[PDB]
Amino acid sequence: EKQRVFTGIVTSLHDYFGVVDEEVFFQLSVVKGRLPQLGEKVLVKAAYNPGQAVPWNAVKVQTLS
């Protein structure tokens, strides 16, 4: 409930952050290794803040191939 580990698709990429599955925000600072490309599948660990505008925030993001 409070944290989830999952694979998902990078759905947008911006200067210092991206989004996974249109719902999980990630700062580029939590990416480990190769920067994901748009639409690429990544492994995500994220925390869930329902009392927040953007509920899911990644604590780690990693490409899978």
Side-chain angles (χ1 to χ4, degrees), residues 21-53:
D21 296 337
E22 290 292 359
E23 73 181 343
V24 183
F25 183 98
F26 68 98
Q27 303 197 11
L28 292 195
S29 58
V30 305
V31 171
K32 185 175 154 181
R34 184 172 59 76
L35 190 74
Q37 289 165 337
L38 193 68
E40 178 162 11
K41 183 171 210 183
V42 296
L43 177 63
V44 186
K45 180 173 174 168
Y48 183 68
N49 203 6
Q52 185 64 60

Side-chain angles (χ1 to χ4, degrees), residues 9 11 13 19 32 44 47 52 62 64:
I9 307 298
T11 50
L13 268 176
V19 180
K32 185 175 154 181
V44 186
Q52 185 64 60
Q62 294 174 278
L64 288 169

